[PDB]
Amino acid sequence: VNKERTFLAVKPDGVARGLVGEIIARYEKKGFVLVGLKQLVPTKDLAESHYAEHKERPFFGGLVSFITSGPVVAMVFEGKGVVASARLMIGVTNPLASAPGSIRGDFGVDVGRAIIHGSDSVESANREIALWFKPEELLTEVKPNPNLYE
Amino acid sequence: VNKERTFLAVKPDGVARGLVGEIIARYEKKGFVLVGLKQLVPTKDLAESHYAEHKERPFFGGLVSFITSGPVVAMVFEGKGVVASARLMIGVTNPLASAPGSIRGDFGVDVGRAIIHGSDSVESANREIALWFKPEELLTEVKPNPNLYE
Amino acid sequence: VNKERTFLAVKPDGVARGLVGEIIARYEKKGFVLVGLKQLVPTKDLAESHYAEHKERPFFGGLVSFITSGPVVAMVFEGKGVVASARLMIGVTNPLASAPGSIRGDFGVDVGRAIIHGSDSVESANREIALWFKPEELLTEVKPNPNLYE
Amino acid sequence: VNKERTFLAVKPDGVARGLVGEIIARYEKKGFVLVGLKQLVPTKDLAESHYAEHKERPFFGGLVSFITSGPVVAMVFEGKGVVASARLMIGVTNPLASAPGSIRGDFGVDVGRAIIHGSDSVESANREIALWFKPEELLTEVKPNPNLYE
Amino acid sequence: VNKERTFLAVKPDGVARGLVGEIIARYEKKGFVLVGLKQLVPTKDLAESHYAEHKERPFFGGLVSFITSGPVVAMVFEGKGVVASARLMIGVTNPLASAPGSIRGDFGVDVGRAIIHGSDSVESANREIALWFKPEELLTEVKPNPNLYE
Amino acid sequence: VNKERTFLAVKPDGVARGLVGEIIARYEKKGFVLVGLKQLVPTKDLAESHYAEHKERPFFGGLVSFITSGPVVAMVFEGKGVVASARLMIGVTNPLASAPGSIRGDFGVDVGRAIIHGSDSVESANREIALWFKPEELLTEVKPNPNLYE
Ligand SMILES: Cc1cn([C@H]2C[C@H](N=[N+]=[N-])[C@@H](COP(=O)(O)OP(=O)(O)O)O2)c(=O)[nH]c1=O
Ligand SMILES: Cc1cn([C@H]2C[C@H](N=[N+]=[N-])[C@@H](COP(=O)(O)OP(=O)(O)O)O2)c(=O)[nH]c1=O
Ligand SMILES: Cc1cn([C@H]2C[C@H](N=[N+]=[N-])[C@@H](COP(=O)(O)OP(=O)(O)O)O2)c(=O)[nH]c1=O
Ligand SMILES: Cc1cn([C@H]2C[C@H](N=[N+]=[N-])[C@@H](COP(=O)(O)OP(=O)(O)O)O2)c(=O)[nH]c1=O
Ligand SMILES: Cc1cn([C@H]2C[C@H](N=[N+]=[N-])[C@@H](COP(=O)(O)OP(=O)(O)O)O2)c(=O)[nH]c1=O
Ligand SMILES: Cc1cn([C@H]2C[C@H](N=[N+]=[N-])[C@@H](COP(=O)(O)OP(=O)(O)O)O2)c(=O)[nH]c1=O
Ligand SMILES: [Mg+2]
Ligand SMILES: [Mg+2]
Ligand SMILES: [Mg+2]
Ligand SMILES: [Mg+2]
């Protein structure tokens, strides 16, 4: 029952830097199956729900203004431990402190331009998924590479 | 014209082999802008209209049954000469005969498993674009990297 | 010592996923010299001796039946600290927990489909080396790139 | 009956340039299955049989002296049209006239250091295979990625 | 002979697009040695003198203006037939007509934002090498990669 | 702030191994701007003065000797926290102890053939930038990639 899922989002800086394919491929190479994928310009109301936990933090206004200043490519990968692994692959919050080899470690320098958002726990994935995805935009079931699993 | 567009779709064989990131990355590095993107499972009625021009050929069914066997990730890129460049980057119809450096030449072997589709003319791109996407699913304030165009 | 050696073997899951070139390329770029290389289908008697140290564990059979289900490409690299570096490059036992940049962290997800084997000590490399190869199957006049060593 | 095979060989310059993995991966990425693989230091008598057609040409002596001055990694790939495709992927005889994207096009400059030998026709593959490979060193049959073929 | 040389210049759009490392690496992988390298901002005298074979042409005015607008990393490579070879690796004048695998064909879209300049013949090269470099800024005699030439 | 700067030097073994393009590209992909770049052959005064914090150390003698033996492509990058960040991307002193993903960990094997030097702090950097570069060989004020900083 390795149908764990996560919500990852390439943000407007990651989008404008011509980084969408590099990020998807890191995950496809790992073994994760893409069950949902679309591009959209986030609305103020999704931007604020999405990042609800930072409503009072200073940078909030600055963050919300950004995630809606342009196209974001939202996606949800599935696979065993996909949530903690995807987080590991992204790096940490400050891109300057991310180990070389992680998405932020190889491409970011400013927390303000973090390139990609990755859900931090199953509970939040679920919240963020239902939030960005109508039920029909998600694939129900299919086969991942049979060499990944037992 | 800098706002010409083409429709591309990574096929079931491309998605499954883990080539969605690899393929998007080449159009991005080329400088093309992704103005529409989404994954889905095509329906019999979508695939027939799509490959309409081959309505009666020895392999129509086998192709219509293939493009429906799994997820496709549709996309539209915009930029100068995108339709014709996108075609050069894809290769020729038979993968084996496509040169190294092209998508079909690097990854393909069978005409049946051609990995990706690309509009062949601007008449078919405007037609195929209209076929897979809705008008609110495409971007508008589009500013490609400031160093690509003079 | 510049002539230390380790034994590595791309597993059935690695060969099948098309990772033999990717994996050899990292040891070559690292500067290690390939002094023995070959592909084969392991026999029950080869695999048991190989994974001898796990003779009695809940997953021995499933691992011995896996390493025999297809081709493995065995190899031995020589160079300073090859055994320990080769281990760092591979990752930790569980792929999900391996960091990005390492072989198991970039491509692996399951402990059962660990992609590659690496000797853990020089006692086991000399033992595993002797296990898979014959003495006339390894090189002698070995001159690594002149810019790697002082 | 797409069990066509070819014999490719990374020569001592390709070997010493740390190029073995890059070449194998180009073919694994394409869809070809590795059915045989080993490393050896070619003997004068295999060097001369192998390149029998150039016995009288001037550069012969110079070629044979080279292909035996070091390790060669011999391999045989299988797949539809693998012979003409592998040739296409290698480039032409003069590396300076090879299109960027082909093995020789991206890495060679001297016909004398051509990096890789690829059989030029089925008839010669068969001759070159039996020549470098004992029957047991070759895998008999297994499954290539099912997305490559119909 | 293998001591031929060519002048390559990564133009303002290549520099700003972050392609300097990608370009230098294609040439290094090829076998050419870097004998000169520097970043400078060109001045008019130099630009008009460099782009003299086009003085009486329509697009002229803009050529000099754009190449004077920012950083250019100039370089000269040495190698057997490096002048004709570098040009092939670059592609043709229009980036849209250039093939995937070449620099302009992989990353370019506009004739006016062609990314890199490369001498078109030996006469033009020894001339251009002289305009951008003082004789002490160029290596005298090198020890190329040992396995490149016969 | 984001106008911090660091001195990076690809050492004789990096240059000879053909890694200059790979190294420059890791930094460009990261977000840093190249403000200085040149290849030169260091002279004793410069080497001893550069490697002064090690004068009274055992390996000293050899350091100066080796870095004077061939071409070095010196460079300085500017970016937010570029000094601490470049160092992390480099790895630690011993290449065998460096992690995959870092420059030394991916390509290095010997402490004495460490491939690249990178300033260890801002004080050391502004000092070293001064030793290798004349003030006119460095860009004054740049227009970095627009989507890197907040
Ligand atoms: C701490 C902090 C975060 N942010 C941004 C970084 C994130 N962008 N993304 N993705 C976003 C959310 O912060 P976060 O949840 O602390 O970081 P993450 O979970 O590692 O992404 O705020 C900011 O702009 N300024 C700050 O001071
Ligand atoms: C002519 C031909 C096409 N097809 C497939 C290959 C394509 N898949 N994709 N993309 C699709 C359309 O055929 P096509 O339009 O001739 O090929 P393309 O324009 O070069 O894509 O039919 C086939 O299976 N066998 C054939 O002989
Ligand atoms: C401990 C453990 C190992 N295995 C597998 C993973 C390995 N495949 N490879 N390489 C092999 C050996 O286990 P291991 O020796 O503990 O792992 P490694 O040294 O890090 O390779 O057993 C398993 O399937 N399940 C387990 O829980
Ligand atoms: C024409 C020519 C070939 N050679 C080398 C190039 C080849 N090395 N390999 N592989 C080998 C065989 O020549 P070939 O069969 O003409 O070339 P290929 O089939 O494209 O490989 O001779 C040479 O050294 N000098 C020459 O003048
Ligand atoms: C002839 C031509 C060139 N240019 C640009 C393209 C080149 N960019 N560079 N380097 C430069 C010189 O033109 P070119 O010599 O025709 O092309 P190149 O030798 O392949 O570079 O002007 C253009 O603006 N329009 C034209 O029709
Ligand atoms: C301390 C140390 C360094 N060196 C080498 C490694 C470095 N190569 N570079 N650049 C250089 C300076 O040593 P270092 O400052 O300890 O390491 P670095 O700052 O990480 O480079 O001497 C060595 O020979 N042995 C040692 O123990
Ligand atoms: Mg968060
Ligand atoms: Mg078509
Ligand atoms: Mg083990
Ligand atoms: Mg031949």
Characterize the bridge pairing of strands E33-40 and A116-118: unpaired
DSSP for chain C, please give it.
-TT-EEEEEE-HHHHHTT-HHHHHHHHHHHT-EEEEEEEE---HHHHHHHTGGGSSSTTHHHHHTTTTSS-EEEEEEESTTHHHHHHHHH--SSGGGSPTTSHHHHH---SSS--EEE-SSHHHHHHHHHHH--GGGS--S----TTT--
Determination method here? X-ray
> E110–B150: do the CB atoms touch at under 8 Å?
yes
- Is residue F8 classed as helix, strand or coil in its secondary structure? strand
- Let me know how long chain C is: 150
CB atoms within 10 A of CB D45: 9
Among candidate residues D61, D54, D56, the one with its CA nearest the CA of residue D117: D54
Read off φ and ψ for residue C124, nearest 5 degrees: -75, -25
Which residues in chain C are contacts of D15 at CB distance < 8 A?
A: 34
Sign of CA dihedral F10, F12, F14, F17: positive
Distance from the alpha carbon of residue F58 to the mean position of ligand 6, in angstroms: 11
Tell the residue nearest (CA) to atom 23 of ligand 1.
A112
CA separation for the pair E86, E102 (Å, rounded):
10
| CB contacts < 8 A (C, F) | 59
Q: Inspect the interface and report whether the beta carbons of D41 and C139 lie closer than 8 Å.
A: yes
User: F128 near F72, Cβ under 8 Å?
Assistant: no
Give the closest residue to F147 by CA, choosing from A71, D107, E136.
A71
Sorted by where each starts, the structural domains of chain E and their CATH numbers stand as: 1-150 (3.30.70.141)
Tell me if B109 and D80 make a contact (CB, 8 A cut-off).
yes
Contacts of E15 (CB under 8 A, 6+ apart): E39, E70, E71, E72, E73, F34
Distance D117 CA to ligand 5 centre (A): 37
- In three state form, how does the secondary structure of C54-82 look? HCCCCCHHHHHCCCCCCCEEEEEEECCCH
- The answer to whether the Cα torsion of A12, A13, A16, A22 is positive or negative is negative
Q: For F41-123, where are the E strands, in sequence order?
A: 72-78, 116-118
Distance from the CA of B111 to the center of ligand 2, in angstroms? 6
Residue in chain C closest to A78 (alpha carbons) equals C109
Residue F79 · residue F85 · CB < 8 Å: yes
Residue C72 and residue C91: Cα distance in Å, rounded? 19
A110: Cβ–Cβ under 8 A, 6 or more apart, which residues? A95, F2, F31, F80, F148, F149, F150
As given in the structure block, the two tokens for residue D13 are 């310059």
CB pairs under 8 A between A and B: 73
One-letter amino acid for residue F130 of the chain? A
- Selected residues 96-135 of chain E with any CB under 8 Å from a CB in chain B: 96, 99-102, 105-110, 112-113
Q: What is the DSSP letter of F31?
A: T
Which whole-number Å values give the CA distances from F28 to A74, E28, F17, F103, in the listed order?
A: 26, 18, 20, 14
CA distance E91 to C149: 38
Return d(Cα A37, Cα A50) in angstroms, integer. 17
d(CA D31, CA B109): 7
* AA identity, residue D148: L
Q: What is the DSSP letter of D96?
A: G
- The number of CA neighbours under 13 Å toward the Cβ of F31 is 31
Asked if D117 is an active-site residue, the reply is: yes
Determine whether the interchain pair D80/B16 forms a contact, defined as Cβ–Cβ distance below 8 Å.
Answer: no
Q: Indicate if the alpha-carbon torsion angle B30, B36, B37, B42 is positive or negative.
A: negative
What is the rounded CA–CA span in Å between residue F150 and residue F137? 28
Pairing of strands B116-118, B72-78: unpaired
Resolution attained, angstroms = 2.3
> In this structure, what token pair is assigned to residue E80?
């057997």
CB E98 within 8 A of CB B84: no
Amino acid at C150: E
Phi then psi for residue A76, to 5 deg, are -135, 115
Using CA atoms, how far residue C11 sits from A10, D20, E13, in Å, is 33, 18, 45
CA distance F106 to F99: 7
Q: D118 CA distance to ligand 10 centroid (A)?
A: 7
**Partner residue facing F21 (CB), from E18, E25, E137:** E25
**Chain A closest-CA separation from residue C58 CA (Å):** 14
- The C-alpha atoms of residue D42 and residue D72 are separated, in whole angstroms, by 7
Amino acid at E44: K
Q: Considering every ligand atom, which ligand is closest to the CA of F111?
A: 6
Amino acid (1-letter code) at residue F133: F
Q: Are β-strands A33-40 and B5-10 bridged in parallel, bridged antiparallel, or unpaired?
A: unpaired
* Side-chain-facing half-sphere of E107: CA atoms under 13 Å: 23
Q: Strand order in B33-40's β-sheet?
A: A116-118, A5-10, A72-78, A33-40, B33-40, B72-78, B5-10, B116-118
B15: its two tokens: 């998605």
C69 vs C47: CA distance, rounded Å = 11
- Taken as a whole, chain D contains a residue count of 150
CB contact under 8 A, B149 and E12: no
Q: Contact, E107 vs E119, CB < 8 A?
A: no
Q: What are the counts of helices (DSSP H) followed by strands (DSSP E) for chain F?
A: 7, 4
Cα-to-chain-centroid distance, residue D52: 16
CA-based torsion, F117, F122, F128, F132: positive or negative: positive
Distance CA A108, CA A92 (A): 11
DSSP codes joined into one string, E63-121:
HHHHHTSS-EEEEEEE-TTHHHHHHHHH--SSTTTSPBTBHHHHH--BTTB--EEE-SS
* Spatial contact of A74 and A40, defined as CB atoms under 8 Å apart: yes
What residues form DSSP beta bridges with D100? D102
Q: What one-character-per-residue DSSP string does D22-45 give?
A: HHHHHHHHHTPEEEEEEEE---HH
CA gap A68, A42 in Å, rounded: 5
Written as six digits, the tokens of D41 are 């230091």
Distance CA E142, CA C117 (A): 41
Q: Which atom of ligand 3 is closest in space to residue C51's alpha carbon?
A: 12
Residues 6+ apart with CB under 8 A from E99: B88, B99, B101, B102, D99, D100, D101, E91, E105
Contacts of E137 in chain F (CB under 8 A): 38, 40
Asked if D113 and D12 count as a contact pair (C-beta separation under 8 A), the reply is no
Residue tagged 């800086």 (tokens): A13
Ligand nearest to the CA of E150: 4
Token reading at A99: 């180990």
Buried b / exposed e over F5-41, threshold 16 CB at 10 Å, is bbbbbbbbbbbbbbbbbbbbbbbbbbbbbbbbbbbbe
CA dihedral in degrees (E104, E110, E116, E119; nearest 10)? 90
Pairing of strands C116-118, D33-40: unpaired
Among protein residues, the one with the nearest Cα to ligand 5's atom 14 is: E93
DSSP state of B135: G
Torsion of CA A147, D83, D12, C33, to 10 degrees: 0
Q: Are the Cβ atoms of A30 and C108 closer than 8 angstroms?
A: yes
Amino acid at A49: S
CA pair distance D37, C72, nearest whole angstrom: 11
Helix (H, G, I), strand (E, B) or coil at F144: coil
The active-site residue out of E5, E11, E104, E117 is E117
* Strands, sheet with E5-10, edge to edge from the N-terminal-most edge strand: E116-118, E5-10, E72-78, E33-40, F33-40, F72-78, F5-10, F116-118
Using the structure block, give the residue that is written with the tokens 């149908």. Answer: A3
Nearest to F9 by CA among F27, E87, D38: F27
